[PDB]
Amino acid sequence: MLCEIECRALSTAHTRLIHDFEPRDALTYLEGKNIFTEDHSELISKMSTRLERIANFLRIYRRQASELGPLIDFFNYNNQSHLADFLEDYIDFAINEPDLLRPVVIAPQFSRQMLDRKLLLGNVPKQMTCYIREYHVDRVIKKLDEMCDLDSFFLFLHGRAGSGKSVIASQALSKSDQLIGINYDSIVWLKDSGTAPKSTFDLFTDILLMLKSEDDLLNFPSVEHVTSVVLKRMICNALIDRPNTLFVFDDVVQEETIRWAQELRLRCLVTTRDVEISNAASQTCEFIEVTSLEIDECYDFLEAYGMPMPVGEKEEDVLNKTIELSSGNPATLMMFFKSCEPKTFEKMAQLNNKLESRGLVGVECITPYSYKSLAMALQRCVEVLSDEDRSALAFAVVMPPGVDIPVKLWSCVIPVLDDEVADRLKRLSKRGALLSGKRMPVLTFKIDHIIHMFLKHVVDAQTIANGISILEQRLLEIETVIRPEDFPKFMQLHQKFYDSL
Amino acid sequence: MLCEIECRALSTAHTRLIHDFEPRDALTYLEGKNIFTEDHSELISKMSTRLERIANFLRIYRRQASELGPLIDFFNYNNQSHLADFLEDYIDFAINEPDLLRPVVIAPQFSRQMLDRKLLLGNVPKQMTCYIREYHVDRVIKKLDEMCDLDSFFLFLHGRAGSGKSVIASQALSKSDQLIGINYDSIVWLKDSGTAPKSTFDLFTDILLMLKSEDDLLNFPSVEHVTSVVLKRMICNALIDRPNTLFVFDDVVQEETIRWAQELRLRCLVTTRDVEISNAASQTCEFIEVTSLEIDECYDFLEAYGMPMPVGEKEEDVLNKTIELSSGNPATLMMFFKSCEPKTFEKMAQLNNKLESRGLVGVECITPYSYKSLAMALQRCVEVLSDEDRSALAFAVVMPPGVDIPVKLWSCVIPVEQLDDEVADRLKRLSKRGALLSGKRMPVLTFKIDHIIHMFLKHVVDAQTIANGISILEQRLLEIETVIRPEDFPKFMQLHQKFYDSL
């Protein structure tokens, strides 16, 4: 055999071996330099046209010669030195010059390549135009290039529900023309939502078909009936073709799906609500959290969608009302714009009210989200919890939202040393991100408003009157500052908040 | 047919028959040396790609030639002597010079990028990164190289449940680049869990497909309906292609599965809870036990996963609490880390408590194990026991865990002339069928019971059945530290009243 460079030279010099070069002329000389067999020679010497005696002379040559020499020592001898010189020069700018082009651009316009073509068969969705989160979309791409060498790995883009985890993939894959082509060769993107015990197999049924190209979606058999093991090994098969290929698993909720991408040794990205699905993986597991929208970042998001900026004082405040409500949440923001009809501080403030008094359902819209209001979405990240975690949850309604509070101070309204309350609470601000893991000054959690007006218009009416009474019970006996235990027996600073019941 | 060495040479020299070798070139010459049929020849001469006219030329060749000769007497004639020479050398370091074959005509092609390949397709799972048990992973690989010559054999990697038997295979196969390529040519890895009377056939249904390459997973017929005998002989068929091939049978529990790998004369590794499945084998049966984690080894496991080391005294003790609890058990350890939230001696000691008072379910996690808590796992190794062994088991809760005690001293709480030699008999069947106790011979025939293998029982046996074993204890109990408690002082088990209080 030869190699990519030695075969690449017979590739490069081709509109020349088309114009002038009779193969027969070389047969006698190459049956001799022992790079042919008499069946070979005649096999090529009796062809109808030359494009045959040439394509056959080339295909057959790249097999027999211990190198490319006994062919330049022929174009020289055949009055065709003008050929053997080109090929000589090509051997020189490869073995003497250790450089040619690097995987880059001499065939430009990846604008429908890396874009359109490669992305659309990855089923990547349209990236976002009118706002882009730098910080994160950047960090991601970075943590990708870092691993494009690695042989299998898990990138967890964990975050809040509806909080815009998927858009950043569509952006961080569509923005940079390196990830596709350069770092990774192809892309395959599947939304999971594996709830069933069968969704997680079936996902990797449609991946196998995401792989299987036009190469028989007709011959698509009864894939539906195959063993877990057969489909799996039958993907290892289909994988020869797609080396350095990247999977996006938009919205995973089953941990079996992750068990699967590590059984299969897959390079994958994951967008998920629940983070602990990563324990199923003993691997290069690296994560990027998707914070509630920073107080500065949101502002920018606003003007991005022609949304008016504060003139006075208690009008930016009647905007801080909204950032306070949608405690940093893209999708519940988008439901707003879409539903801020006039666009005045006026009609926005009508809504700040519809919210305190109709929860998330008071903005329920046709947002580009696959959900009406957030409530529809959250409903799920709820039913997933343990019947025990579920209980301890819907009780922590009765609270100060956007207020930082001690563990014992929570122990009062919660079911079961109150070290176990501490335990559930963390399982929560982890399994769908619902609170706050704050270590110092003192082991305290929080509860945002979005993650509240959901609860608010969702828990059985009596269950609130009950949590509040259960509050006052303990509550007795013997601003940038956490409220100490010199003054716990009264939660009266927040009587204010507590009035709204 | 040929054989493992004659077929192993066409296996070894393969990134060469990929780079340069047209099968058609050999058809005319082999229809002639009478090692083909005209249907055969055209059958291979009209293929779309060469990887076909090559895989078909190889599969078909290993059938027709009384030996491998009429193929080296061709690569010589086809200007491809650089091939026929490799294969000549390979015949030489097998029929003349034993041994020199692996160092010489095999290693200079070792490719660490080709493991990975071989491995993904053996369905070997990702080896473990952040901790590796030297002692064992090493011993294994050793006991493998020892047999890569042998024609069929059983390596039993027996051990406790969840105690990390399978990880060591993924490591001992993925760490050393000799086992794959050098010692053994290819690898096939299947998790058994054969409970049904049909799981054990079906396993060897999916192996047959593990073998059958892209060569018709489309044409996969109604394999489901074939006789035991036909599938079996139909694997002997499929085996011509995979000589020196290694099977891993992650977690076997049916002994029929072993009857099968010895009917088939298979080179296999086995990870298992129950050890007696080896009696079904009259063979080179060699075993490696997987001990509870050594008291030093565990420590290392800890720091491996950024876990804090003892500053004071009764804080390493409130670590020795945990090693004492998970009486050397990887998977029940992993459930811990995953669930040691802050990571302080504090929050770890909260858990030392959740354990004494919620058994294994007090750490039940999403560990990389295929089980929540160990309990889910053990449940099985339990329902396997004989209804009689099952009884004698759940009674030996009422005990001192991590305490070494006499047989008669057990005879008291256990079911069944007048000689308690039968208690002795069940107890051994136990620390063998899932490893549950302790086979200690001298000073005196005594067993033990670890804590993990206890807080399972603890939160599992019917409440009354404990109040009952304890009363049944005191009954006999009367009548007429590095030292076993003698029989001068048996009538009182009061040293362990301490332990016994927790009831």
Ligand SMILES: Nc1ncnc2c1ncn2[C@@H]1O[C@H](COP(=O)(O)OP(=O)(O)OP(=O)(O)O)[C@@H](O)[C@H]1O
């Ligand atoms: N420019 C933008 N960048 C990021 N997110 C945006 C942008 N514009 C709007 N969004 C909001 O995010 C919504 C969809 O977000 P996304 O699907 O990423 O959330 P998610 O966290 O993936 O939720 P899930 O995984 O549960 O579907 C949009 O319909 C919109 O409400």
Ligand SMILES: Nc1ncnc2c1ncn2[C@@H]1O[C@H](COP(=O)(O)OP(=O)(O)OP(=O)(O)O)[C@@H](O)[C@H]1O
């Ligand atoms: N080297 C290791 N590093 C970290 N964790 C380990 C290691 N070995 C074992 N474990 C623990 O054990 C789990 C898998 O254990 P393993 O599969 O080895 O046990 P097993 O004896 O095979 O049980 P079974 O026979 O039922 O498969 C891991 O998810 C982890 O919790």
Ligand SMILES: [Mg+2]
């Ligand atoms: Mg989405």
Ligand SMILES: [Mg+2]
């Ligand atoms: Mg296992």
